[PDB]
Protein backbone atom coordinates (compact mmCIF):
# COMPACT_ATOMS: atom_id res chain seq x y z
CA UNK A 1 0.00 0.00 0.00
CA UNK A 2 1.28 3.38 1.22
CA UNK A 3 4.18 2.53 3.49
CA UNK A 4 5.43 -0.18 0.54
CA UNK A 5 5.17 2.06 -2.41
CA UNK A 6 7.05 4.99 -0.63
CA UNK A 7 9.44 2.46 0.56
CA UNK A 8 9.70 1.78 -3.45
CA UNK A 9 10.02 5.21 -3.44
CA UNK A 10 12.70 5.73 -1.56
CA UNK A 11 14.64 2.98 -2.98
CA UNK A 12 14.63 4.60 -6.31
CA UNK A 13 16.20 7.63 -4.47
CA UNK A 14 19.36 6.36 -3.05
CA UNK A 15 20.38 4.56 -6.31
CA UNK A 16 19.20 8.23 -7.64
CA UNK A 17 22.03 9.70 -5.54
CA UNK A 18 24.78 7.28 -5.81
CA UNK A 19 24.76 7.76 -9.84
CA UNK A 20 25.48 11.49 -8.35
CA UNK A 21 28.16 10.62 -6.47
CA UNK A 22 30.12 9.20 -9.50
CA UNK A 23 31.05 11.80 -11.38
CA UNK A 24 31.63 11.46 -15.25
CA UNK A 25 32.85 14.52 -16.79
CA UNK A 26 35.87 12.62 -17.75
CA UNK A 27 33.88 10.64 -19.63
CA UNK A 28 32.34 12.86 -21.81
CA UNK A 29 35.66 12.88 -23.77
CA UNK A 30 35.26 9.16 -24.49
CA UNK A 31 32.17 8.71 -25.77
CA UNK A 32 28.89 9.74 -27.32
CA UNK A 33 26.51 6.46 -27.34
CA UNK A 34 26.93 6.28 -22.98
CA UNK A 35 24.72 9.76 -22.88
CA UNK A 36 22.22 8.23 -25.04
CA UNK A 37 20.98 5.14 -22.81
CA UNK A 38 21.43 7.71 -19.37
CA UNK A 39 19.56 10.41 -21.46
CA UNK A 40 16.71 8.04 -22.45
CA UNK A 41 16.98 6.92 -18.33
CA UNK A 42 16.61 10.53 -17.89
CA UNK A 43 13.73 11.44 -20.34
CA UNK A 44 12.00 8.21 -18.85
CA UNK A 45 12.50 10.22 -14.96
CA UNK A 46 11.13 13.95 -16.73
CA UNK A 47 8.13 11.12 -18.27
CA UNK A 48 6.40 10.66 -14.94
CA UNK A 49 6.94 14.39 -14.04
CA UNK A 50 5.45 15.85 -16.94
CA UNK A 51 2.40 13.19 -16.06
CA UNK A 52 2.20 14.69 -12.81
CA UNK A 53 2.02 18.01 -13.72
CA UNK A 54 -0.48 16.63 -16.28
CA UNK A 55 -2.64 15.34 -13.41
CA UNK A 56 -2.21 18.38 -11.04
CA UNK A 57 -3.45 20.07 -14.29
CA UNK A 58 10.84 22.92 -13.98
CA UNK A 59 8.46 26.32 -13.55
CA UNK A 60 5.73 23.63 -13.96
CA UNK A 61 6.77 22.18 -11.00
CA UNK A 62 7.38 25.13 -8.73
CA UNK A 63 4.02 26.91 -9.91
CA UNK A 64 1.85 23.23 -8.77
CA UNK A 65 4.17 22.76 -5.60
CA UNK A 66 3.31 26.43 -4.50
CA UNK A 67 -0.37 25.41 -5.69
CA UNK A 68 0.10 21.79 -3.35
CA UNK A 69 1.46 23.56 -0.09
CA UNK A 70 -1.92 26.06 -0.52
CA UNK A 71 -4.21 23.83 -0.31
CA UNK A 72 -2.42 21.63 2.88
CA UNK A 73 -1.98 24.92 4.97
CA UNK A 74 -5.98 25.37 4.70
CA UNK A 75 -7.13 22.07 5.97
CA UNK A 76 -4.89 22.67 9.29
CA UNK A 77 -5.92 26.22 10.30
CA UNK A 78 -9.14 24.61 9.43
CA UNK A 79 -8.87 21.52 11.69
CA UNK A 80 -7.12 24.40 14.41
CA UNK A 81 -10.19 26.32 13.86
CA UNK A 82 -12.49 23.92 14.83
CA UNK A 83 -10.83 22.48 18.15
CA UNK A 84 -10.14 26.08 19.55
CA UNK A 85 -13.81 27.17 19.13
CA UNK A 86 -14.83 23.79 20.63
CA UNK A 87 -16.17 41.96 13.69
CA UNK A 88 -18.85 39.30 12.46
CA UNK A 89 -17.63 35.88 11.68
CA UNK A 90 -19.31 33.71 9.63
CA UNK A 91 -20.68 30.72 10.80
CA UNK A 92 -20.94 27.18 8.96
CA UNK A 93 -23.36 24.09 10.35
CA UNK A 94 -21.34 21.44 8.06
CA UNK A 95 -18.09 20.45 9.30
CA UNK A 96 -19.35 19.96 12.61
CA UNK A 97 -21.34 16.67 12.19
CA UNK A 98 -20.50 13.38 12.75
CA UNK A 99 -20.88 11.91 9.68
CA UNK A 100 -18.86 14.46 7.31
CA UNK A 101 -20.40 15.17 4.17
CA UNK A 102 -20.02 13.18 0.80
CA UNK A 103 -21.09 14.31 -2.58
CA UNK A 104 -19.68 11.76 -4.77
CA UNK A 105 -22.67 9.99 -5.33
CA UNK A 106 -20.84 6.52 -5.95
CA UNK A 107 -23.86 4.62 -5.36
CA UNK A 108 -27.81 5.45 -5.29
CA UNK A 109 -28.87 7.47 -2.15
CA UNK A 110 -29.26 4.82 0.63
CA UNK A 111 -31.99 5.55 2.72
CA UNK A 112 -31.20 6.88 6.31
CA UNK A 113 -33.94 5.00 7.90
CA UNK A 114 -32.86 2.44 10.36
CA UNK A 115 -36.22 2.33 11.78
CA UNK A 116 -39.29 1.77 10.65
CA UNK A 117 -42.47 2.59 12.46
CA UNK A 118 -46.06 1.81 11.97
CA UNK A 119 -44.74 -0.45 9.04
CA UNK A 120 -47.09 -2.82 6.67
CA UNK A 121 -43.60 -4.67 5.33
CA UNK A 122 -40.42 -5.71 7.10
CA UNK A 123 -37.96 -3.21 6.88
CA UNK A 124 -36.25 -5.89 5.57
CA UNK A 125 -37.89 -6.14 2.88
CA UNK A 126 -38.07 -2.57 2.53
CA UNK A 127 -34.14 -2.22 2.17
CA UNK A 128 -33.35 -4.76 -1.25
CA UNK A 129 -31.45 -4.57 -4.35
CA UNK A 130 -33.18 -4.89 -7.82
CA UNK A 131 -31.80 -4.98 -10.98
CA UNK A 132 -31.76 -2.67 -13.81
CA UNK A 133 -34.60 -2.59 -16.36
CA UNK A 134 -32.91 -2.10 -19.77
CA UNK A 135 -35.62 0.39 -20.11
CA UNK A 136 -34.95 1.81 -16.78
CA UNK A 137 -31.79 2.12 -14.54
CA UNK A 138 -32.51 0.54 -11.20
CA UNK A 139 -32.77 2.92 -8.11
CA UNK A 140 -33.10 1.94 -4.26
CA UNK A 141 -37.18 1.42 -3.03
CA UNK A 142 -38.64 3.88 -1.36
CA UNK A 143 -39.02 2.47 1.98
CA UNK A 144 -42.59 3.33 2.83
CA UNK A 145 -44.19 3.25 -0.30
CA UNK A 146 -46.40 -0.37 0.60
CA UNK A 147 -47.43 1.96 3.71
CA UNK A 148 -48.33 5.15 1.13
CA UNK A 149 -50.34 3.23 -1.40
CA UNK A 150 -51.81 0.54 1.36
CA UNK A 151 -52.42 2.34 4.91
CA UNK A 152 -55.65 3.13 5.49
CA UNK A 153 -56.65 7.36 6.34
CA UNK A 154 -57.85 8.06 9.68
CA UNK A 155 -62.03 9.06 8.79
CA UNK A 156 -61.67 12.39 10.97
CA UNK A 157 -60.06 14.23 7.82
CA UNK A 158 -62.53 13.02 5.13
CA UNK B 1 -18.78 24.30 -16.38
CA UNK B 2 -17.21 20.64 -15.29
CA UNK B 3 -14.23 22.79 -13.65
CA UNK B 4 -16.92 24.35 -11.32
CA UNK B 5 -18.92 21.66 -10.99
CA UNK B 6 -15.78 19.82 -9.68
CA UNK B 7 -14.97 22.65 -7.40
CA UNK B 8 -18.61 22.74 -5.76
CA UNK B 9 -18.56 18.84 -5.13
CA UNK B 10 -15.28 19.19 -3.50
CA UNK B 11 -15.24 22.04 -0.96
CA UNK B 12 -19.25 21.43 -0.84
CA UNK B 13 -20.59 24.70 -2.11
CA UNK B 14 -23.06 25.83 -4.70
CA UNK B 15 -21.48 26.60 -8.43
CA UNK B 16 -22.30 29.93 -8.43
CA UNK B 17 -20.18 30.09 -5.28
CA UNK B 18 -17.47 29.52 -6.88
CA UNK B 19 -18.52 31.20 -9.51
CA UNK B 20 -21.48 33.08 -10.94
CA UNK B 21 -22.83 32.60 -14.64
CA UNK B 22 -22.11 36.61 -14.99
CA UNK B 23 -18.30 36.11 -14.26
CA UNK B 24 -17.82 32.70 -16.21
CA UNK B 25 -19.86 35.05 -19.26
CA UNK B 26 -16.59 37.31 -18.93
CA UNK B 27 -14.28 34.34 -19.61
CA UNK B 28 -15.87 33.26 -22.59
CA UNK B 29 -16.36 36.33 -23.42
CA UNK B 30 -13.08 38.21 -22.80
CA UNK B 31 -11.24 35.12 -22.86
CA UNK B 32 -7.69 36.13 -21.09
CA UNK B 33 -4.62 34.25 -21.21
CA UNK B 34 -3.07 35.37 -18.58
CA UNK B 35 -3.44 35.36 -14.63
CA UNK B 36 -3.94 39.08 -15.13
CA UNK B 37 -7.13 38.97 -16.86
CA UNK B 38 -8.49 36.86 -14.52
CA UNK B 39 -8.84 37.80 -11.21
CA UNK B 40 -9.84 41.53 -12.23
CA UNK B 41 -13.23 41.18 -14.13
CA UNK B 42 -16.90 43.40 -14.17
CA UNK B 43 -17.45 44.38 -10.58
CA UNK B 44 -15.35 41.66 -8.14
CA UNK B 45 -14.03 38.26 -8.07
CA UNK B 46 -14.96 35.11 -5.41
CA UNK B 47 -12.77 33.30 -3.56
CA UNK B 48 -12.80 29.97 -5.45
CA UNK B 49 -11.34 31.21 -9.21
CA UNK B 50 -9.09 33.54 -7.25
CA UNK B 51 -7.08 30.84 -5.88
CA UNK B 52 -7.30 28.90 -8.92
CA UNK B 53 -6.91 31.90 -11.76
CA UNK B 54 -3.69 30.53 -12.76
CA UNK B 55 -5.55 27.29 -13.47
CA UNK B 56 -8.38 29.44 -15.43
CA UNK B 57 -5.60 31.14 -17.81
CA UNK B 58 -3.86 27.87 -18.61
CA UNK B 59 -7.16 26.55 -18.96
CA UNK B 60 -7.83 29.31 -21.67
CA UNK B 61 -4.34 28.48 -23.07
CA UNK B 62 -5.30 24.81 -23.12
CA UNK B 63 -9.36 26.17 -24.61
CA UNK B 64 -7.75 28.09 -27.39
CA UNK B 65 -5.58 25.75 -29.18
CA UNK B 66 -8.61 23.51 -30.12
CA UNK B 67 -10.64 26.22 -31.59
CA UNK B 68 -7.70 27.10 -34.57
CA UNK B 69 -7.52 23.40 -35.59
CA UNK B 70 -11.44 23.44 -36.77
CA UNK B 71 -11.18 26.56 -38.64
CA UNK B 72 -8.67 25.55 -41.65
CA UNK B 73 -10.47 21.94 -42.31
CA UNK B 74 -13.82 23.89 -43.32
CA UNK B 75 -13.31 25.19 -46.47
CA UNK B 76 -12.62 21.69 -48.29
CA UNK B 77 -15.67 20.18 -47.48
CA UNK B 78 -18.05 22.22 -50.51
CA UNK B 79 -16.63 21.86 -53.66
CA UNK B 80 -17.39 18.27 -53.89
CA UNK B 81 -21.26 18.65 -54.85
CA UNK B 82 -21.24 19.08 -58.64
CA UNK B 83 -19.06 16.22 -58.97
CA UNK B 84 -21.58 14.64 -56.52
CA UNK B 85 -23.62 14.93 -59.55
CA UNK B 86 -21.67 14.20 -62.06
CA UNK B 87 -21.11 10.45 -61.37
CA UNK B 88 -24.82 9.54 -62.38
CA UNK B 89 -24.11 11.08 -65.64
CA UNK B 90 -21.12 8.76 -66.01
CA UNK B 91 -22.91 5.63 -64.48
CA UNK B 92 -25.77 6.23 -67.22
CA UNK B 93 -24.67 4.56 -71.04
CA UNK B 94 -24.31 6.93 -73.47
CA UNK B 95 -25.96 4.04 -75.62
CA UNK B 96 -29.21 4.47 -73.73
CA UNK B 97 -29.25 8.10 -74.74
CA UNK B 98 -29.18 7.52 -78.58
CA UNK B 99 -32.00 4.68 -77.84
CA UNK B 100 -34.16 7.00 -76.17
CA UNK C 1 32.54 -2.79 -15.94
CA UNK C 2 32.46 -1.24 -12.64
CA UNK C 3 29.67 1.54 -13.91
CA UNK C 4 27.77 -1.52 -15.17
CA UNK C 5 25.96 -2.75 -12.28
CA UNK C 6 24.39 0.83 -11.20
CA UNK C 7 23.22 1.74 -13.98
CA UNK C 8 21.71 -1.81 -14.33
CA UNK C 9 20.01 -1.42 -10.38
CA UNK C 10 18.74 1.73 -11.57
CA UNK C 11 17.67 0.86 -14.83
CA UNK C 12 15.46 -2.02 -12.90
CA UNK C 13 14.15 0.58 -10.16
CA UNK C 14 12.63 3.06 -12.99
CA UNK C 15 10.47 -0.13 -14.64
CA UNK C 16 9.81 -1.16 -10.94
CA UNK C 17 8.19 2.42 -10.07
CA UNK C 18 7.16 3.04 -13.62
CA UNK C 19 3.86 0.88 -13.25
CA UNK C 20 3.02 1.91 -9.66
CA UNK C 21 3.06 5.83 -10.58
CA UNK C 22 1.12 4.60 -13.52
CA UNK C 23 -1.39 3.31 -10.56
CA UNK C 24 -1.20 5.90 -8.83
CA UNK C 25 -1.44 8.66 -11.22
CA UNK C 26 -4.51 6.86 -12.89
CA UNK C 27 -7.06 8.98 -11.32
CA UNK C 28 -7.14 13.00 -11.49
CA UNK C 29 -6.15 14.12 -7.25
CA UNK C 30 -9.13 16.21 -7.64
CA UNK C 31 -11.08 12.75 -8.14
CA UNK C 32 -9.47 11.04 -5.47
CA UNK C 33 -9.61 14.18 -3.47
CA UNK C 34 -13.96 14.24 -3.57
CA UNK C 35 -13.76 10.31 -3.04
CA UNK C 36 -12.37 10.20 0.65
CA UNK C 37 -14.61 12.49 3.36
CA UNK C 38 -11.90 12.09 5.85
CA UNK C 39 -9.98 15.54 6.22
CA UNK C 40 -7.68 13.44 7.96
CA UNK C 41 -7.21 11.56 5.15
CA UNK C 42 -6.82 14.24 2.63
CA UNK C 43 -4.09 15.80 4.31
CA UNK C 44 -2.22 12.30 3.65
CA UNK C 45 -2.71 11.98 0.41
CA UNK C 46 -1.66 15.32 -0.71
CA UNK C 47 1.35 15.53 1.65
CA UNK C 48 1.96 11.68 -0.16
CA UNK C 49 1.60 13.93 -3.36
CA UNK C 50 4.21 16.68 -2.08
CA UNK C 51 6.77 14.23 -1.34
CA UNK C 52 7.25 12.33 -4.95
CA UNK C 53 7.57 14.56 -6.96
CA UNK C 54 9.86 16.52 -4.68
CA UNK C 55 11.79 13.10 -4.81
CA UNK C 56 11.67 12.36 -8.30
CA UNK C 57 12.37 15.56 -8.95
CA UNK C 58 15.86 15.42 -6.81
CA UNK C 59 16.03 12.43 -8.37
CA UNK C 60 15.81 13.85 -11.82
CA UNK C 61 18.69 17.10 -11.00
CA UNK C 62 20.81 14.34 -9.35
CA UNK C 63 20.81 12.61 -13.13
CA UNK C 64 21.46 15.20 -14.13
CA UNK C 65 24.45 16.67 -12.75
CA UNK C 66 23.49 20.23 -12.14
CA UNK C 67 25.81 22.17 -9.97
CA UNK C 68 23.82 23.29 -7.36
CA UNK C 69 21.16 21.83 -5.33
CA UNK C 70 20.02 24.19 -2.47
CA UNK C 71 16.90 24.97 -4.66
CA UNK C 72 15.84 21.14 -4.91
CA UNK C 73 16.60 20.54 -1.23
CA UNK C 74 15.19 23.07 -0.13
CA UNK C 75 11.18 21.84 -1.39
CA UNK C 76 12.22 18.49 0.18
CA UNK C 77 12.26 20.43 3.45
CA UNK C 78 9.26 22.08 2.87
CA UNK C 79 7.30 18.96 2.18
CA UNK C 80 9.21 17.81 5.61
CA UNK C 81 8.13 20.78 7.20
CA UNK C 82 4.54 19.94 6.42
CA UNK C 83 4.48 16.38 7.16
CA UNK C 84 5.61 16.91 10.19
CA UNK C 85 3.04 19.48 10.96
CA UNK C 86 0.37 16.42 10.20
CA UNK C 87 2.11 14.06 12.24
CA UNK C 88 2.42 16.17 15.28
CA UNK C 89 -1.01 16.98 15.38
CA UNK C 90 -2.55 13.57 15.07
CA UNK C 91 -0.25 12.75 18.68
CA UNK C 92 -1.97 15.57 20.37
CA UNK C 93 -5.20 14.26 19.37
CA UNK C 94 -4.73 10.38 20.74
CA UNK C 95 -2.97 11.63 24.22
CA UNK C 96 -6.43 13.53 24.88
CA UNK C 97 -8.09 10.25 23.95
CA UNK C 98 -5.93 8.52 26.22
CA UNK C 99 -6.58 10.49 29.31
CA UNK C 100 -10.40 10.02 29.04
CA UNK C 101 -9.62 6.03 28.70
CA UNK C 102 -7.49 6.58 32.03
CA UNK C 103 -10.46 8.10 34.15
CA UNK C 104 -12.69 4.80 32.78
CA UNK C 105 -10.24 2.63 34.31
CA UNK C 106 -9.79 4.27 37.79
CA UNK C 107 -13.72 4.23 37.92
CA UNK C 108 -13.46 0.31 37.22
CA UNK C 109 -11.22 0.36 40.17
CA UNK C 110 -13.48 1.98 42.49
CA UNK C 111 -16.70 -0.28 41.95
CA UNK C 112 -14.18 -3.29 42.09
CA UNK C 113 -13.28 -2.35 45.55
Known amino acids: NPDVLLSRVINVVRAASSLASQDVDFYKNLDRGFSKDLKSKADKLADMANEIILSIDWNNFGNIMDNLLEMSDHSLDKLNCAINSKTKRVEKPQLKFKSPIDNSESHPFIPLLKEKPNALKPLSESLRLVDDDENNPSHYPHPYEYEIDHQEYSPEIL | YQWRDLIARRDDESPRFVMPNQLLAALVAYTPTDVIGVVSLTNGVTEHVRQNAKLLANLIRDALRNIKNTNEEATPIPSSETKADGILLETISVPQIRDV | ?113
Open chain 3, 1 to 113: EKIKPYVRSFSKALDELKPEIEKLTSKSLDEQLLLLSDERAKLELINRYAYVLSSLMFANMKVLGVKDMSPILGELKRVKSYMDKAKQYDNRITKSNEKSQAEQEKAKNIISN
